A paper describes a structure:
[name] from [name] K−12 (EcDsbA) was the first and is probably the best-characterised DSB enzyme to date. This 21 kDa periplasmic protein is a dithiol oxidase that catalyses disulphide bond formation between consecutive cysteines of unfolded polypeptides as they are translocated to the periplasm. EcDsbA consists of a canonical TRX domain, a hallmark of proteins involved in redox homeostasis, with an inserted helical domain. The TRX domain harbours the conserved active site CXXC (C30-P31-H32-C33 in EcDsbA) that is featured in many proteins of the TRX superfamily. The acidity of this groove originates from a cluster of negatively charged residues (E24, E37, E38, D44, E85, D86 and E94) that map along a buried channel in the interface between the TRX and helical domains of EcDsbA.
[name] [name] and double-mutant E24A/[name] were crystalised in space group C2, with two molecules per asymmetric unit. The crystal structures of the three mutants containing the [name] mutation showed that the shorter alanine side chain at position 58 significantly expanded the size of the entrance to the buried channel. In all three crystal structures, a glycerol molecule, used for cryoprotection, was modelled into the electron density. The binding of glycerol displaced w2 in all three structures and hindered precise analysis of the water network in these mutants. However, examination of the three lysine mutant structures showed that w1 was strictly conserved, forming hydrogen bonds to the backbone amide of C33. When E37 was present in the protein structures, water w3 was observed to form a hydrogen bond with E37 in both [name] and E24A/[name] structures. Additional water molecules (labelled as w’ in Figure 4F–H) were modelled into the electron density in the buried channel in all the lysine mutants. E24A caused a 2.9-fold reduction in the initial rate, while [name] resulted in a 1.9-fold reduction in the initial rate. The [name] mutant exhibited an oxidation rate of 2.10 ± 0.17 × 106 M−1 s −1, which is also not statistically different from the wildtype. However, the double-mutant E24A/[name] yielded a rate constant of 1.47 ± 0.06 × 106 M−1 s −1, 35% slower than that of wildtype EcDsbA. These results indicated that E24A and [name] did influence [name] oxidase activity, but its individual effect may be too small to be detected in this assay.
Numbering used by the authors: 1 to 188
The structure:
């Protein structure tokens, strides 16, 4: 078959009840996640092909970067709570990996301030229990798919994308295949 379990995707031995329809894990410290988002634009290419009524969810992970990695998962919770993911994704990736100007929680906050989030608004979100719950949700979701590394993407809590089984010859053929596989899985 054109799509095969073990080729473009694998199947979770323990499917996750109630999981987001399309769930991406990443770290702003992960070099391959930087390529996925800033060079390949995997998330946007996937979103453009999702069936009607299917949304993409993206969660940050703690296991890269120590203290700052956890601060970034909390800041990503703030971005989710405030609905500013599209304002801060590029400056967080570039701040951590390109300019390496993000070295502390204050430097993360500066990205939000510079993007026009008011200081009081960021700080109230950072300290909120809504954000504490969002951190816990990101952690629980990684546990539920037995996450071992990033980038990673899971469809309907049942299928894990397998980019190492796709055609990696041309970067744009690869992005197309990745996005087409997510669409296929979302309809399975």
């Amino acid at each position: 078959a054109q799509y095969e379990d073990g080729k473009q995707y694998t199947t979770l031995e323990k499917p996750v009840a109630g999981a987001p329809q399309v769930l991406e894990f990443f770290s702003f410290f992960c070099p391959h996640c930087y390529q996925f988002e800033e060079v390949l634009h995997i998330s946007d290419n996937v979103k453009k092909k999702l069936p009607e009524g299917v949304k993409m969810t993206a969660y940050h992970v703690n296991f890269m970067g120590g203290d700052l990695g956890k601060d970034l998962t909390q800041a990503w919770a703030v971005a989710m709570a405030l609905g500013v993911e599209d304002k801060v994704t590029v400056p967080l990736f570039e701040g951590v990996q390109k300019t390496q100007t993000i070295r502390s929680a204050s430097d993360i906050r500066d990205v939000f301030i510079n993007a026009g989030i008011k200081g009081e608004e960021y700080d109230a979100a950072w300290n909120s229990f809504v954000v504490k719950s969002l951190v816990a949700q990101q952690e629980k979701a990684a546990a539920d798919v037995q996450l071992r590394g990033v980038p990673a993407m899971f469809v309907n809590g049942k299928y894990q994308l397998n980019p190492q089984g796709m055609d990696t010859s041309n970067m744009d053929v690869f992005v197309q295949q990745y996005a087409d596989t997510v669409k296929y899985l979302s309809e399975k």
